[PDB]
Structure 1
Amino acid sequence: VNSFSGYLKLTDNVYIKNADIVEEAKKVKPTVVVNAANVYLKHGGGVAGALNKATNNAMQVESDDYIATNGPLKVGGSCVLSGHNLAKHCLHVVGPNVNKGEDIQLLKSAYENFNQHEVLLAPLLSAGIFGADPIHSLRVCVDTVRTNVYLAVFDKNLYDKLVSSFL
């Protein structure tokens, strides 16, 4: 039993809700919140910019130190950093940017990072400025993640469409 509320069950282990991941994080304070990051951990907009703003830029300060030490992430890769005031930890995951020419097959690799954590609050990956159709992303999530994932879907029309879709 956990403190997530109002989620619609999609499979044994995947749950979905029309919600802003930032507000879900502030309310639930989960163990792991997933950020939809780029390889430079430059949190400008979308999920990343909104999460970072909610941390008063502390996420960006921590991220810049991480990059200065370790260099950029791989597309499809991840790192665990602090969750600041939003969660115990933040799992920064890089989905492929199809508008950068990056291989959509790397979306499966990106979701594989979720399997290292028993429970996560997460957005759909690659479905923002990275291009990728959200229907495909939800499908990859369901077919890749085996741990318990609570998906926060920002756009209501998109959520309704995802819920009403079989294939």
Structure 2
Amino acid sequence: MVNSFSGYLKLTDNVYIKNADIVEEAKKVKPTVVVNAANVYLKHGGGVAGALNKATNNAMQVESDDYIATNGPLKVGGSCVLSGHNLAKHCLHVVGPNVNKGEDIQLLKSAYENFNQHEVLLAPLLSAGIFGADPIHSLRVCVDTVRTNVYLAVFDKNLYDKLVSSFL
């Protein structure tokens, strides 16, 4: 079905990419699902998580603290669905491995598998940015793992251009 995502470059049958600030893109589109680059404690301090949480006026963090108090930490490679607040219907909090914590990059595939539970998502590249993985690798795993329709927002223009120009 037609959707309102605009200005994306089509990489494959199901994967699209744009140089965009995921906060602004979520505010404009109000997608059914926005993906957060979460950690196991849902402590949304920085990176994508800090930015999304700030845009919710800390409501995402308040909700997340209750989630953790009830359920305990997520697994690396795991996820949970919480409110999307003012950004989306739902936020899919997905934990990619953090290379700066020594976590196994193979868990990146498991992390992306969570996307297949949703027909359409707005998402960042998992484990990129402050999580320390190579974004080119993250994009490859995304394309080779996600079968549902995923609209990727890449914050940095230089990285966006490199991701497009190196894509196989």
TM-score interval for Structure 1 and Structure 2 normalised by the shorter chain: over 0.9
How far residue 78 of structure 1 moved from its aligned partner, in angstroms, is 0.1
How far residue 132 of structure 1 moved from its aligned partner, in angstroms, is 0.5
Give the structure-1-normalised TM-score.
Answer: 0.99
Query: SS of 2:39's equivalent?
Result: coil
* Cα distance between partner residues in 2 of 1:160 and 1:6: 14
**How many residue pairs align between the two structures?**
167
* Cα distance between partner residues in 2 of 1:55 and 1:8: 28
How far residue 164 of structure 1 moved from its aligned partner, in angstroms, is 0.3
How far residue 102 of structure 1 moved from its aligned partner, in angstroms, is 0.4
Give the structure-2-normalised TM-score.
Answer: 0.98
- Identity percentage of aligned residues: 100
* Cα distance between partner residues in 2 of 1:46 and 1:97: 12
* 1:5-55 Cα deviation digits (max 9, x unpaired): 000000000000000000000000000000000000000011000000000
* 1:34-80 Cα deviation digits (max 9, x unpaired): 00000000000110000000000000000000000000000000000
* Cα distance between partner residues in 2 of 1:27 and 1:97: 29
Question: Residue in 2 aligned with 1:162?
Answer: 163
* Cα distance between partner residues in 2 of 1:48 and 1:67: 16
How far residue 99 of structure 1 moved from its aligned partner, in angstroms, is 1.1
**2:103 aligned with 1:99:** no
Distance change >3 Å, CA 3–CA 72, structure 1 → 2: same
* Cα distance between partner residues in 1 of 2:167 and 2:42: 34
Question: Residue in 2 aligned with 1:111?
Answer: 112
Query: SS of 1:129's equivalent?
Result: helix
How far residue 166 of structure 1 moved from its aligned partner, in angstroms, is 3.2
How far residue 161 of structure 1 moved from its aligned partner, in angstroms, is 0.3
Q: How does 1:6-17 map to 2 (within 5 A)?
A: 6-17=7-18
Query: SS of 2:128's equivalent?
Result: coil
* 1:110-164 Cα deviation digits (max 9, x unpaired): 0000000000000001011111000000000000000000000000000000000
Moved over 6 A (4+): none
* Cα distance between partner residues in 2 of 1:23 and 1:68: 30
Which sections of structure 2, spanning at least 5 residues, go unmatched? Answer: none
